[PDB]
Coordinates of N, CA, C and O and ligand atoms in Angstrom, one line a residue:
X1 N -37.0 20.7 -10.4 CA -36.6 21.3 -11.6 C -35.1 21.6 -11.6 O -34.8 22.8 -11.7
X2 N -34.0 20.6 -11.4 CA -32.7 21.0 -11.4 C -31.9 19.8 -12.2 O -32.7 18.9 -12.5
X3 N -30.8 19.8 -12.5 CA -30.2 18.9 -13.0 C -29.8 17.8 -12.5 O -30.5 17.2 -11.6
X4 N -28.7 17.4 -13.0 CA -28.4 16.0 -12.1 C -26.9 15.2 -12.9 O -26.4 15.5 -14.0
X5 N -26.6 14.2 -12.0 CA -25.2 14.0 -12.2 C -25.4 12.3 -12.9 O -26.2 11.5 -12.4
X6 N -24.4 11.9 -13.9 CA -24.8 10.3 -14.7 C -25.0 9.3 -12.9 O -25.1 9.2 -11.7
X7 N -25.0 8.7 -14.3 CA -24.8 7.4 -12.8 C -23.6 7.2 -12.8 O -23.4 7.3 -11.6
X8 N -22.5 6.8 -13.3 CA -21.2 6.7 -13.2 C -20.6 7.9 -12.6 O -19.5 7.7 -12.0
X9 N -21.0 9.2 -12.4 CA -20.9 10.4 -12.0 C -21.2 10.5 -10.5 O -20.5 10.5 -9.5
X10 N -22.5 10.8 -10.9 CA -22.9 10.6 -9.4 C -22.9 9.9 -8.6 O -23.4 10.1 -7.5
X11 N -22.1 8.4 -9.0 CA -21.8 7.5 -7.7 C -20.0 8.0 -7.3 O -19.3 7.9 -6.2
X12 N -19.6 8.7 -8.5 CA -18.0 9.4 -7.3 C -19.1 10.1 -5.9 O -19.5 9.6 -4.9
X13 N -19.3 11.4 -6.6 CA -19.4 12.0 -5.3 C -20.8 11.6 -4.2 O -21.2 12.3 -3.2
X14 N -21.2 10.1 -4.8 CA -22.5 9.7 -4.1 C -21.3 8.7 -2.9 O -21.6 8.5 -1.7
X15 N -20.3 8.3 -3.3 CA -19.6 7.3 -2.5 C -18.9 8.0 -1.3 O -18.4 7.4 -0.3
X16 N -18.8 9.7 -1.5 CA -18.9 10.6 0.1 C -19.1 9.4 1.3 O -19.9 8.5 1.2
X17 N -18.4 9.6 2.3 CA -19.2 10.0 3.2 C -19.5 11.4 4.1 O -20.4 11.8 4.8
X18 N -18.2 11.9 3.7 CA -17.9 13.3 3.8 C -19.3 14.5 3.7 O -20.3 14.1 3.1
X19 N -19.4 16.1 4.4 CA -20.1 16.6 3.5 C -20.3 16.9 2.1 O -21.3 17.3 1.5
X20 N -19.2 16.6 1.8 CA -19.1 16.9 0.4 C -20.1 16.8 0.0 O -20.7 17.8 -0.2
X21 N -20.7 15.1 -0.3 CA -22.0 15.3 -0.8 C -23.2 15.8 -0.8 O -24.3 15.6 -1.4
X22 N -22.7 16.7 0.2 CA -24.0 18.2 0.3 C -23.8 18.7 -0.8 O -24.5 18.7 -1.8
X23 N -22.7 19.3 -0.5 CA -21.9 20.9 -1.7 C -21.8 20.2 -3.0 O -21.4 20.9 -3.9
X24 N -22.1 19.1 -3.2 CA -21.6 18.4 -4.8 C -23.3 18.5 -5.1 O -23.7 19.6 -5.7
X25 N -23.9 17.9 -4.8 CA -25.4 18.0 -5.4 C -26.2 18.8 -4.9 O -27.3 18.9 -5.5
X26 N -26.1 19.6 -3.8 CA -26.6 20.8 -3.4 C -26.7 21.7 -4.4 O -27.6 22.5 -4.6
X27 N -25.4 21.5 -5.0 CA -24.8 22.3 -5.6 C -25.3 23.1 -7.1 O -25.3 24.3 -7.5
X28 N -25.8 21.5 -7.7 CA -26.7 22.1 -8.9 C -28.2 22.8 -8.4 O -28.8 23.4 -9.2
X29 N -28.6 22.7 -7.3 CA -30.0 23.1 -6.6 C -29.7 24.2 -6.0 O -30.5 24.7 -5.2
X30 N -28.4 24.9 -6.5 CA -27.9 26.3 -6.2 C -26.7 27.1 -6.5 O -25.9 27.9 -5.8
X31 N -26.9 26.5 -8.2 CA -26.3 26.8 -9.1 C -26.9 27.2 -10.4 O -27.8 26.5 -10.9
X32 N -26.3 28.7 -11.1 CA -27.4 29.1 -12.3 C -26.5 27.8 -13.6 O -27.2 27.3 -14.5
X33 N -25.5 27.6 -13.5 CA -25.0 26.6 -14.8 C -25.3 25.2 -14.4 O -25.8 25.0 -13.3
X34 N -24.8 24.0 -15.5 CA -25.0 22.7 -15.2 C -23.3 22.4 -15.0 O -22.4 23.0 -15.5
X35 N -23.2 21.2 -14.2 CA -22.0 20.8 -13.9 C -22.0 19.1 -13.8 O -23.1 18.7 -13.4
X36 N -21.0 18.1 -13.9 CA -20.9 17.0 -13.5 C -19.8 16.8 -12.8 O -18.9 17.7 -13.0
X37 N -19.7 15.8 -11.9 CA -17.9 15.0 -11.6 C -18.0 13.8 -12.1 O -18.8 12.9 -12.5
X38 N -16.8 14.0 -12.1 CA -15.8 13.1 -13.1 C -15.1 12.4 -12.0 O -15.3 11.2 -12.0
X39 N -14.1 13.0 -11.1 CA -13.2 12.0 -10.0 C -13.6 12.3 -9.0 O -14.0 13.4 -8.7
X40 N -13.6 11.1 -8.2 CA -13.8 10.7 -6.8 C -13.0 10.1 -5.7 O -12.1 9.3 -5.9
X41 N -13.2 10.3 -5.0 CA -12.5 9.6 -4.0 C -12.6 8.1 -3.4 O -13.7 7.6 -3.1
X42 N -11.4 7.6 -3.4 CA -10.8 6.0 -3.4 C -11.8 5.9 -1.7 O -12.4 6.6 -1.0
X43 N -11.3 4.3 -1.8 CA -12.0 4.1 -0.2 C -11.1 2.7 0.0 O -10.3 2.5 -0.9
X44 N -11.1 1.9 1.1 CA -10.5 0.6 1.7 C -9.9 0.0 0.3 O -8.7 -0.3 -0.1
X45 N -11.3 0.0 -0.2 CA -11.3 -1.1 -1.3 C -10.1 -1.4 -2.5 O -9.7 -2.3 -3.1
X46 N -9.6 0.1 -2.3 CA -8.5 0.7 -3.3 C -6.9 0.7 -2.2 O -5.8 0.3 -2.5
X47 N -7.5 1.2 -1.0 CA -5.9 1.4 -0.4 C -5.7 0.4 0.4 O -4.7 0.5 1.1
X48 N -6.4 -0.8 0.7 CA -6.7 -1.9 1.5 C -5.2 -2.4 -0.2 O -4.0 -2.1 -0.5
X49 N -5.9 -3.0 -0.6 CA -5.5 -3.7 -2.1 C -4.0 -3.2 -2.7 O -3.1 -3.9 -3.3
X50 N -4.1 -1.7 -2.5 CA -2.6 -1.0 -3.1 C -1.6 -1.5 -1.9 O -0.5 -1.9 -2.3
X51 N -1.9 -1.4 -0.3 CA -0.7 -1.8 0.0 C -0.8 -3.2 0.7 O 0.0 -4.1 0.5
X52 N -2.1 -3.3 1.8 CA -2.6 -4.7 2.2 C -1.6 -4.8 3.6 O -1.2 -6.0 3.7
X53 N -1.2 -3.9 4.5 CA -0.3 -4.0 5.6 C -0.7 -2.7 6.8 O 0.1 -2.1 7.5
X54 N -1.5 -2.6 6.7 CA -1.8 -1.5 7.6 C -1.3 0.4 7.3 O -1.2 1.4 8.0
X55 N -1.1 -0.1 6.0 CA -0.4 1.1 5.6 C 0.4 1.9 6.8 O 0.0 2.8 7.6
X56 N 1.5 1.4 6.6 CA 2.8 2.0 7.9 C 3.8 3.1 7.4 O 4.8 3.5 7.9
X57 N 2.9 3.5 6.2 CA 3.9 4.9 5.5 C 3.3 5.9 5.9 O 3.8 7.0 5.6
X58 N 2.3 5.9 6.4 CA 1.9 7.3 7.4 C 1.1 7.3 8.7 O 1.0 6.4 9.5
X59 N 0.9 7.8 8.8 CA 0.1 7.8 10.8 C -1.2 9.1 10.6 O -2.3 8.8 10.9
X60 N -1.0 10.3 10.2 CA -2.0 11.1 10.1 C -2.0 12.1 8.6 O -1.7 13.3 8.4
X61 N -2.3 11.4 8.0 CA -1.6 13.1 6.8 C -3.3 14.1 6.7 O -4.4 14.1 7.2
X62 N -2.3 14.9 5.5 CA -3.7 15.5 5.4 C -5.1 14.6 4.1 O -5.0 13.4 3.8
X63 N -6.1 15.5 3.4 CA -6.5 15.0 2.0 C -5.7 15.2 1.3 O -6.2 15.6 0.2
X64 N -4.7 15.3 1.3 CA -4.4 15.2 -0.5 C -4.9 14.6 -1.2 O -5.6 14.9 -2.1
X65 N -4.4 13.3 -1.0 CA -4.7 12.1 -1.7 C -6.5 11.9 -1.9 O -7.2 11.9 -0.8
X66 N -7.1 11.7 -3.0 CA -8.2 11.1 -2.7 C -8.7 9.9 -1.9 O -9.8 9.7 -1.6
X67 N -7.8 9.2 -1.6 CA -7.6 8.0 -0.3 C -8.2 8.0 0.6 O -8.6 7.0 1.2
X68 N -8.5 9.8 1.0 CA -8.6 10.6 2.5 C -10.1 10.3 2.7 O -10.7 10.2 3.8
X69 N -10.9 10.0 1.0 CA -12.6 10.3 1.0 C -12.6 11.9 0.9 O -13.7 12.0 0.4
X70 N -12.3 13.0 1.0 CA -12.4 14.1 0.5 C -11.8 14.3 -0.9 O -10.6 14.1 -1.1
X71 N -12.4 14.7 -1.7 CA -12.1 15.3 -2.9 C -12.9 14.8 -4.3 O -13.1 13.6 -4.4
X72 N -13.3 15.6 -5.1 CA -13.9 15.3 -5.8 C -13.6 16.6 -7.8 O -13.8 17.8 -8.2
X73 N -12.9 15.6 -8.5 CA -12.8 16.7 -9.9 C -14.1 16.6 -10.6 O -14.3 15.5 -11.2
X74 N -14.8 17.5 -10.7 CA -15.6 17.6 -11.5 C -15.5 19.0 -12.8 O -14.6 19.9 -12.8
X75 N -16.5 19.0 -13.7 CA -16.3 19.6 -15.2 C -17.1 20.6 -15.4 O -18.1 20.5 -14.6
X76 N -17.2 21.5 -16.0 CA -18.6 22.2 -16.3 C -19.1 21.7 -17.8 O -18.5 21.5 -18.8
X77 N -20.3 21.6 -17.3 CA -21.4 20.6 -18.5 C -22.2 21.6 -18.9 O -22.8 22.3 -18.0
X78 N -22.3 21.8 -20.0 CA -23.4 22.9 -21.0 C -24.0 22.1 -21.7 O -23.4 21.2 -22.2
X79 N -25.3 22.2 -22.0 CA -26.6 21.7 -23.4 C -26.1 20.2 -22.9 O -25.9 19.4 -23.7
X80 N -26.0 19.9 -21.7 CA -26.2 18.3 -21.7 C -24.8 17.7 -22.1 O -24.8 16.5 -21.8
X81 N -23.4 18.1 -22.7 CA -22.0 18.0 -22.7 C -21.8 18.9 -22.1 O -22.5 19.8 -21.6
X82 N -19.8 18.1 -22.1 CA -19.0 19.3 -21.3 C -18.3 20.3 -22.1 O -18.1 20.1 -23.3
X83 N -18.0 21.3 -21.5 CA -18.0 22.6 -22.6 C -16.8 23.0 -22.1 O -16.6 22.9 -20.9
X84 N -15.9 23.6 -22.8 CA -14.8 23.8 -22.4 C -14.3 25.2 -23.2 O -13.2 25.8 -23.1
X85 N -14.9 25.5 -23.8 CA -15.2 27.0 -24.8 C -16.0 27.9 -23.7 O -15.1 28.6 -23.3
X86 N -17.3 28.2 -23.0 CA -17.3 28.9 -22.5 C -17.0 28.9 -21.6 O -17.5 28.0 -20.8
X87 N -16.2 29.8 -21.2 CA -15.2 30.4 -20.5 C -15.9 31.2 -18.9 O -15.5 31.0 -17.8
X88 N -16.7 32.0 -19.2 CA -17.4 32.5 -18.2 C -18.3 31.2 -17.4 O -18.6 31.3 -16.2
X89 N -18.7 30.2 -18.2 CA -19.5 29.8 -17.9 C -19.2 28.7 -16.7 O -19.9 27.9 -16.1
X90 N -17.6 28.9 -16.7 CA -16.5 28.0 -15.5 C -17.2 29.0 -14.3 O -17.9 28.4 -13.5
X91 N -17.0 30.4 -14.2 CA -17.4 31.4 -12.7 C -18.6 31.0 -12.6 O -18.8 30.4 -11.5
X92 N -19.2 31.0 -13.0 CA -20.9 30.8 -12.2 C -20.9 29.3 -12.0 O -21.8 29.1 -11.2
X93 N -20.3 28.1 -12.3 CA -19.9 27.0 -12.3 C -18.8 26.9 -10.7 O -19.1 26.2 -9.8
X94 N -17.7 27.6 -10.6 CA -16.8 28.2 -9.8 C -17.7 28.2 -8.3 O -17.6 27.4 -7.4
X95 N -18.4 29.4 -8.4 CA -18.9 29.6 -6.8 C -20.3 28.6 -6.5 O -21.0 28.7 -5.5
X96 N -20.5 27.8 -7.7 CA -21.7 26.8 -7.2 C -21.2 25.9 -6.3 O -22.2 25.3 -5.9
X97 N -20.3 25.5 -5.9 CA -19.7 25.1 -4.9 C -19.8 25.8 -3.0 O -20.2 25.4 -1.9
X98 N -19.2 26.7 -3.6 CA -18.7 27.4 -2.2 C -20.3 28.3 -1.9 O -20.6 29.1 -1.0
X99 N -21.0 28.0 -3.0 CA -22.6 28.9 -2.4 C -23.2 28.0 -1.7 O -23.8 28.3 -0.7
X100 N -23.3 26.1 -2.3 CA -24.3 25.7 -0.9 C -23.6 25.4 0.2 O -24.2 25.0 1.2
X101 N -22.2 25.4 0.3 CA -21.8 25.7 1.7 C -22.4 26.2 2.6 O -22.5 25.8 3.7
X102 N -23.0 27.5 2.0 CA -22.9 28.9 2.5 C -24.8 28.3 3.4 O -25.2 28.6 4.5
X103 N -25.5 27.5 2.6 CA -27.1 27.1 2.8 C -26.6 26.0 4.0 O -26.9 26.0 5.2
X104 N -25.7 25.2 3.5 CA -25.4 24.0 4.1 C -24.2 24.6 5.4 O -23.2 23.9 5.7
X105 N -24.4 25.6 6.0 CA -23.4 25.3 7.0 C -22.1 25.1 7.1 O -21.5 25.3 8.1
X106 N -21.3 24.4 5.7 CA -19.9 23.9 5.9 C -19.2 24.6 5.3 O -19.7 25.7 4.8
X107 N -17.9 24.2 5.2 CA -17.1 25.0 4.2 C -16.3 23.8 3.3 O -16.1 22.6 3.4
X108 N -16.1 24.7 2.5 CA -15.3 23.7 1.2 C -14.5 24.4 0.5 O -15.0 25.4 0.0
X109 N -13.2 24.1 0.0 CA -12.6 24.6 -1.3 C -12.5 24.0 -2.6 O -12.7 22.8 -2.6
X110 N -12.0 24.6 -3.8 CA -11.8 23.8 -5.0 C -10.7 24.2 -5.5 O -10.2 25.0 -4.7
X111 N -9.9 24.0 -6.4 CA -8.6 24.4 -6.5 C -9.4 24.3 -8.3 O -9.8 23.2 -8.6
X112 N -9.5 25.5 -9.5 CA -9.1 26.2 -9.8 C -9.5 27.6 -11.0 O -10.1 27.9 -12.0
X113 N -8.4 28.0 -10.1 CA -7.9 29.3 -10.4 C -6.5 29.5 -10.4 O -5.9 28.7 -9.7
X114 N -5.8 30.7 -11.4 CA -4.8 31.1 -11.6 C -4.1 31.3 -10.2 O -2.9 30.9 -10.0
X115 N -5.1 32.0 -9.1 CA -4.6 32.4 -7.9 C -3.4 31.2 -7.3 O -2.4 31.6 -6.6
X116 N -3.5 30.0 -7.6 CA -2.4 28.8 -7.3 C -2.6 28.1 -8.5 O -1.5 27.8 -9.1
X117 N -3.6 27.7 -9.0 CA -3.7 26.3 -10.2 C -3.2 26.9 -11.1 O -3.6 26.1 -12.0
X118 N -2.4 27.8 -11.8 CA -1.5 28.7 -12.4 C -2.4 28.7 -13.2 O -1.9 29.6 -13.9
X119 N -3.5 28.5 -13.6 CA -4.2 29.7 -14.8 C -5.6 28.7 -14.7 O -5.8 27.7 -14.0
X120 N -6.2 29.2 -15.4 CA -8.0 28.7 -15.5 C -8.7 29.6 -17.0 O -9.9 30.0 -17.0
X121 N -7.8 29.7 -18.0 CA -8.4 30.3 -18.8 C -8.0 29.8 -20.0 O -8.4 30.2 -21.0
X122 N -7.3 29.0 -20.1 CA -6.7 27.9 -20.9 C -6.6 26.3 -20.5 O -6.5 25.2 -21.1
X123 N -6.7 26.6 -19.4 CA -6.2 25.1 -18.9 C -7.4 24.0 -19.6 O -7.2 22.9 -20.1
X124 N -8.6 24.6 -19.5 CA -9.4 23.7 -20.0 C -9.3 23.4 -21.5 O -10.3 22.9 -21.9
X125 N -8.5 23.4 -22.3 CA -7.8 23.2 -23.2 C -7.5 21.9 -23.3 O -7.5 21.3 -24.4
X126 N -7.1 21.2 -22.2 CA -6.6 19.9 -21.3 C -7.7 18.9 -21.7 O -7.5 17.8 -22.3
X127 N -8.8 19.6 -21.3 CA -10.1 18.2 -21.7 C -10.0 18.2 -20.7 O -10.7 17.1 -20.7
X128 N -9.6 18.4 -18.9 CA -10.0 18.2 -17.5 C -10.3 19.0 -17.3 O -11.2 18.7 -16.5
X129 N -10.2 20.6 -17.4 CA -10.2 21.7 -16.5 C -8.9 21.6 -16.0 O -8.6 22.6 -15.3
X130 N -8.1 21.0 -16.1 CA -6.9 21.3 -15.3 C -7.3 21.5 -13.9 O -6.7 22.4 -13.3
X131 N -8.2 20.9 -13.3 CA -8.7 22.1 -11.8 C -9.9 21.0 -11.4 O -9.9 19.8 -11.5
X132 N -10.5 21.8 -11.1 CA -12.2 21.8 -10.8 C -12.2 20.8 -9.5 O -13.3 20.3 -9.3
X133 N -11.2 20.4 -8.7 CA -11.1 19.4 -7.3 C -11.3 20.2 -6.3 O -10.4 20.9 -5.8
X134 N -13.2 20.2 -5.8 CA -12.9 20.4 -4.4 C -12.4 19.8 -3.3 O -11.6 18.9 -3.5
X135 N -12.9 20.1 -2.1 CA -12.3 19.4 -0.6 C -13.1 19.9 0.1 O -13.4 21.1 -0.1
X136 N -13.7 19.3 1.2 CA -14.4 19.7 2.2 C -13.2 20.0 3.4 O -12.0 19.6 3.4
X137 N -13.9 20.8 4.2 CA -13.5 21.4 5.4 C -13.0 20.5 6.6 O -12.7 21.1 7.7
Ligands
LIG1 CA1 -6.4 27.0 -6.7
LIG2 ZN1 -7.7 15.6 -8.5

């Protein structure tokens, strides 16, 4: 009895190999709102092709880049769309993330909030959330 992510959806954060894909679909199975993703993280296939040389512009970085296989933007989805009017309905959306961590053992963050993503109360205004990219641990 829980929701679930499209198929164009749930193959971003089904293409993990990361935990992520715990905390992403865990996530509706321990979460009171509905949510989807939207972006995912790149693999060979993408950075094999972008540069095709052993990529010699870096040696270790961190995720930033979706490149890394960590990260994932996803939306908050109400009545089956995404809803970008209620506003509260981002917080209980918010810690559905970082709660099946909490089942699942790992940790994870998302980026957003005002606290750095400089606001979260407008931003969804954007039509992305301006935000909503976690990262596993
Ligand atoms: Ca943030
Ligand atoms: Zn992103």
């Amino acid at each position: 009895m829980s929701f679930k992510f499209g198929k164009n959806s749930e193959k971003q954060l089904a293409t993990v190999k990361p935990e992520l894909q715990k905390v992403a679909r865990r996530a509706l199975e321990l979460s009171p709102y509905d949510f989807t993703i939207v972006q995912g993280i790149r693999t060979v296939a993408q950075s094999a092709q972008n540069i095709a040389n052993g990529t010699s512009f870096l040696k270790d970085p961190s995720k930033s880049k979706h490149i890394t296989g960590d990260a994932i933007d996803f939306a908050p989805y109400i009545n089956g769309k995404i809803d970008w009017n209620d506003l509260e309905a981002f917080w209980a959306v918010k810690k559905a993330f970082e709660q099946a961590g909490k089942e699942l053992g790992i940790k994870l963050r998302f980026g957003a909030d005002w606290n750095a993503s400089g606001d979260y109360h407008d931003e969804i205004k954007r039509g992305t959330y301006d935000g909503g990219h976690v990262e596993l641990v």
